Structure formats: C-alpha cells, structure tokens
Amino acid sequence: DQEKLFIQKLRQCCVLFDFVSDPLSDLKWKEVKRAALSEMVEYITHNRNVITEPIYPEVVHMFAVNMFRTLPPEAAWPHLQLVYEFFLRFLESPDFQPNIAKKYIDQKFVLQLLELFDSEDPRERDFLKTTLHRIYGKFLGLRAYIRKQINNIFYRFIYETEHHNGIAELLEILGSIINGFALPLKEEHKIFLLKVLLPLHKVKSLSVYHPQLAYCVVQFLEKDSTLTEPVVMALLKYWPKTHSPKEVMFLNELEEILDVIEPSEFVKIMEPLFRQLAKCVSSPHFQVAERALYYWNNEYIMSLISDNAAKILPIMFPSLYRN
Amino acid sequence: FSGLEPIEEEPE
C-alpha cells in the first residue's frame, strides 16, 4: 500500500539526529533524509490523486518539526530547502483540499511560520514569502488573522523598534493582496495605508524594503484614486529635508506615483509637489538633481505639465515666469 | 519586486 509508505518516509524525516563519534553514519543519515525528501517531492509533483486525507497531519507535523525552531543570533540549508519545496508543491497540488487542511493549519501554525520571517537567510525568507502567499489564497478563514498579525509586526517595527529582516518580503505579499482588493475599500485598509504604510517611509532602514513599499503605495492608488492627496502630502512630510542620496528613493516613488495618477487628483497636490521638486533640481547632490530632471523623459508627466503650465513653470523657473 | 500573482479578495 503506497499511502502507508508515504507516511513512513514522512515520519522518518521527523527524526532529528546527531553523531559526534561517527561522522559517516551522520552523512548517511543526512543523505538518507535528503533522499527521502527528494523522493517525496517528485512523488507529489507528478503523480495524481496521491494526496489522501490521512496524509495532511503527517505533512504539517513533518514541516513543524523541521522548520519551527529557534533562530540563532541556516547551515543545514540543503535539508531546509527540500522541506519548503515539498511543502510548497504540497499546497500547489490539484489534489489539495483546504477544508481538510484547515484542521491542521490553524492560527498557531501561521504564527509560528511568521517567526521564521525574522530569519537572516534571504533564500529562506523567499520560501517563507511564497508559502504564506499560498495559505492566504486558499485558507479564507486565515486571511483576517494574517492581516492582523502582519499589521502587528509593522506597528512593532516603526514604533517599538522591533527590527525585522522580513519587512521587504512581507510587503511583497501585501501588494499581491492590495492588487486584488474588492470594490469599495474597507476603512480597515485605508487606515493601514495611511497609519502604517506611510509611516514606514519614516524608518531608517528604508533602503532595504523601499521598492516593495512603493509598490504597495502605488497599488493602493491604482485601486482607489481618492487617496492620492493624503499619500503625496505625507511623502513630502516624510521627505528627507536633509539633502541626502536617500531622496532618490522618494523621487523614484513619486515618479512611480505620477505614472498612475488621475489628472483630476494631480491638480490637488501639484503645487506642493513641484516646490519640493524644484528644491531637488537645485540640490547640491548631483544624483538627486539628475533624478529629478529625469522626470521630463516621462511623456504622461509632460502632458500633465503643459495642461497646467500656468501653475508649474512659475515654480520650477521663478526667474522666468510670474503669477 | 512583483513575481507574486494577485489574490482576488472575496467574502471571507
């Protein structure tokens, strides 16, 4: 019976071992366990209807025993990478039924998985990123708990200085959610964009998670072009008043906001924008000015400028125009 | 960084 041997090899991978007086049995045990994982990865990726009901607790148990650990202030990445892979192909499988898995993938599991985002291994955080994205898309009953617990991590990172190596990869997930949001946006989300996503531009380690943060900010305005006024005004607030090469990030974000800005809302914030933008063209840092002047290579911006030339050119070149 | 495909929010 094949279903029995599947469970045997699963439980076999729940035995964590160590040999200090036998460096060869250790290697075999590793190789025996690395091989059993590979065998199961192939078995589940290519065979149809092999995922039966008794399997689910075995898989979640095998994942929890290997992955849910304590992160040192990993080394056996060959093994850890196979586990995430197997668990990933297990979620993606067409034989996967969330109604049965909902029993064993509870909130405690999701919580424990989020602890691992603090890990300092980019390749591990990349597997955790993908894994959490499959859970959200199939476990409707966990979508709320995840948002609440992610909204917690961010709140801890801005205010309580709870540094997190996983901020970048968490934002990347949120963008996948924001892009699929529903008709009127809930106030729960608006608050998050305003009272969480924008204050993220305030933290010092912005250099690491800025591209993904900007994506979420743009995806929010792509849905509801109502929030483009408080977004832009906040960015000019959080704008580094100190002339620094970190302005290039804001110019990037602002040009990315302008490529999707609704012209009816552009005029609502076009004056305070260019006052700052003119300051950038006058910056003592070439990279800042070079970037602000690269705005003109944007055709949709030029149209927005010429259709409002009466207000812009006075600000950009006050020597040459008046009001 | 993109990569991940969107998730159509629908009634929980």
Residue numbers in the entry:
A (entry chain A): 37 to 109, 128 to 377
B (entry chain B): 1221 to 1232
The authors write:
The KIF4A LxxIxE motif peptide (CSPIEEEAH), like that of Emi2, was previously shown to bind B56 weakly (KD, 32 μM). In order to test this, the KIF4A sequence was mutated to the stronger LxxIxE motif by mutating 1224CS1225 to LE (KIF4ALE; the structures of B56γ:LxxIxE complexes show that the ‘L, Leu’ binds the deep hydrophobic pocket on B56γ while the ‘E, Glu’ mimics a phosphorylated Ser, which forms multiple salt bridges with B56γ residues H187, R188 [these residues are conserved in all B56 isoforms]). The affinity of KIF4A1192-1232,LE for B56γ increased 50-fold compared to WT KIF4A (KD of 0.32 μM). Mutating KIF4ALE residues 1231AH1232 to PE further enhanced KIF4A binding (KD of 0.10 µM). Specifically, KIF4A residues 1207 to 1232, which includes the basic patch and the LxxIxE motif, were broadened beyond detection upon binding B56γ. A crystal structure of the KIF4A1192-1232,LEPE:B56γ complex showed that while the LxxIxE motif is well-ordered, electron density corresponding to a single conformation of the basic patch bound to B56 was, as expected, not observed. That is, the basic charged patch of KIF4A binds B56γ but does so via dynamic, rapidly interchanging conformations even when bound to B56.
Proteins containing validated LxxIxE motifs bind B56, an all α-helical heat repeat protein, in a deep, highly conserved hydrophobic pocket. Here we describe a novel dynamic, charge-charge interaction for a major protein phosphatase, PP2A-B56, which significantly contributes to our understanding of the diversity of mechanisms used by this phosphatase to select its substrates. This novel interaction is mediated by a patch of basic residues that dynamically bind a highly conserved acidic surface present on all B56 isoforms and therefore constitutes a novel pan PP2A-B56 binding motif.
